[PDB]
Design a protein around this ligand. Structure first.
Ligand SMILES: [Cl-]
Length: 170
């Protein structure tokens, strides 16, 4: 009874595969619900007047041996995004930790500023523990994550556009 959601990814417009994620609704239900709803689009419109939906959004930064950073569906550059609760929402808890590749964690701009931006880790990032809320994990498609990672760079700039071409709940 953890929900599962997915991204179908394109690289330069072409399918790269599917990433399937399990969400820790048992541990961080409010955070999991935000992410689940951003996958389905079911809540409609955000504060921005744009759809609360990851579909069509790009990864703004992809950093080899660190993580993929995405979820800015209003600007695609790491300065936008919003949650189903409004512009920001509180840090629910820090129970789950950044233990390795496949960890799903919320990006933020300090305490209690969760929106829609998220991280998919490609390494163990323990220094983020207690600062970023971990709310799930990749359960299928780490090879897709690796393919995306290879289009990244140290600055995070991608050599081809990395887009969530479709998403939803399974
Ligand atoms: Cl905590």
């Amino acid at each position: 009874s953890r929900p599962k959601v997915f991204f179908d990814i394109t690289i330069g417009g072409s399918n790269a595969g599917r990433i399937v994620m399990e969400l820790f609704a048992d541990i961080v239900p409010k955070t999991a619900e935000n992410f689940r709803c951003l996958c389905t689009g079911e809540r409609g419109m955000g504060r921005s007047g744009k759809k609360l939906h990851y579909k069509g959004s790009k990864f703004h930064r992809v950093i080899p041996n660190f993580m993929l950073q995405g979820g800015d569906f209003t600007r695609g550059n790491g300065t936008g995004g919003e949650s189903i609760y409004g512009e920001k929402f509180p840090d629910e808890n820090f129970q789950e930790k950044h233990t390795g590749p496949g960890v799903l964690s919320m990006a933020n701009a300090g305490p209690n500023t969760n929106g829609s931006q998220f991280f998919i880790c490609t390494a163990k990032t323990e220094w983020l523990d207690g600062k970023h809320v971990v709310f799930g994990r990749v359960v299928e498609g780490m090879n897709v994550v690796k393919a995306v990672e290879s289009k990244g760079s140290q600055s995070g700039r991608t050599s081809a556009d990395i887009v969530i071409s479709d998403c939803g709940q399974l």
